[PDB]
Amino acid sequence: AKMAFTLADRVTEEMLADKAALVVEVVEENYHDAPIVGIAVVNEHGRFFLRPETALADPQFVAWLGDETKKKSMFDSKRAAVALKWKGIELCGVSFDLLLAAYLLDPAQGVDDVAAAAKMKQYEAVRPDEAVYGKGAKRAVPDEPVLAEHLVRKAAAIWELERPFLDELRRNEQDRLLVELEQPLSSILAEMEFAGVKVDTKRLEQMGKELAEQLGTVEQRIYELAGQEFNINSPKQLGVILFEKLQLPVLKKTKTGYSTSADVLEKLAPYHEIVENILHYRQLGKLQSTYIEGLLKVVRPATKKVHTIFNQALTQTGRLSSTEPNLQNIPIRLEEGRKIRQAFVPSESDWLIFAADYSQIALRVLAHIAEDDNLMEAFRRDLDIHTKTAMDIFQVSEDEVTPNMRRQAKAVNFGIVYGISDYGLAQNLNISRKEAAEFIERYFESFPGVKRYMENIVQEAKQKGYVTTLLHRRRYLPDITSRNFNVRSFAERMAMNTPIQGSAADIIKKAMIDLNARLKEERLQAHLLLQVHDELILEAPKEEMERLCRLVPEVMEQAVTLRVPLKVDYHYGSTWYDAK
DNA sequence: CCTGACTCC
């Protein structure tokens, strides 16, 4: 706890060295259009704090920020890059991101600030953010001297921690994963978040007004069927109605009371007309609260754009998550909800939305990894395995498969390969539990390689204490040797699933990097808007569609070469809804 | 603030 630094009133030449740890501090969780409260720079010449009004209106500091040959080490550089974009400033030359480094070394640590990263190497000369800024309503930027010291201590930590973190990544064979995949991706996500997605608020509001009326009609029907008014959105009050007043069978309990999950209620549909109406009500209510109202709340009124934040250092598998708003869970399965997608439109006139999705990429990845002959065969003969399962499940022909049936058969394929039980399967399909068990048996017998892979991957996790993905991402599984059956089982199924979902995540990230480079090298105006796990969404002038119809799927397909091919479907249209 | 509901991959 002893560290000298300069509290600078102006920018000097020595603050602009070609190598520096840089902190650009943004305290609000949502960094879009959020205040930069201070800057700190640490380099061979010393340690510096600058006020943002000083630094960010200085033409030399702005120049240095934007000079890719001036290298910066940071923590959460995407947060800084995006905040700086909202201030009209370009940040380049980020060569090390401690957040992403810590994330690759162990995603379970939940590293979310520099102090937490520091603890991984027993570096303790830096405070946690929460201790400096406080919590909830008490959250505040502290007095300049305290803030200055905090930002400089963070910068010093990044400075000292870079080499030890790189060394450990290197020992793990994850240095290139960080430097050639996650760090370049961070810059691409920053562009996408800043660009935002344009929303047709006129249409969304009209939808919302019509939905409110429809919701009211269903709400009354429900009260009529119940013989009484009650809060449908309280599973507690609903439970009394269904299971006490109406005396319907109790199929499941939670720790707080009776279950009213969709799975359960669907099973009660033959007992009383009220259950179907409740399900419908809860769907419509979620549309209203989340995809109409919640979405309008986050629309930037002046531009009509929404700006998601893609969390790149959160999930345990290597996936992204999307927040405020989550643009990776916009409805599609039911037509009622799918219409929400009509409100997502191109950011200018005569542009179009272009959507491309990998076909069954998880399962191709698994065919490659397991080297299963049959499954590989199905993808080398390139069939549609989900539809095939559907033909089997509903004892119907190819042309006889309805989009809902395939979706049910897709969940069954995913279920079985990832360790669903006979109980779980029998429930989902309403067959005898013996039938369910026989079906799983027939399944693994039809794909013995997948069978062997899943047995082997579990024993490997027991022995090493972690599993890996195709590009060397890691997940530690300390619970896999637990004496407790449930605990051990959950860990075992993580060993079965994480390597595949995580590998699929590795591949699409690589494709995003490849695609962006091809787009920029052709000076196309087309740019990425969103990633939805196995899908990439772009917008571009209508004139560019032809080029995109070739380039996007080709780049995606070539991102990696597996034993089986990768296949991508694509569509475009005037709205996200129409890109189908 | 947690639980359980709905949404997606």
Add this chain to the structure above:
DNA sequence: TGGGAGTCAGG
């Protein structure tokens, strides 16, 4: 008693 996420209203 398949895996990974976020947001919401209610309590």
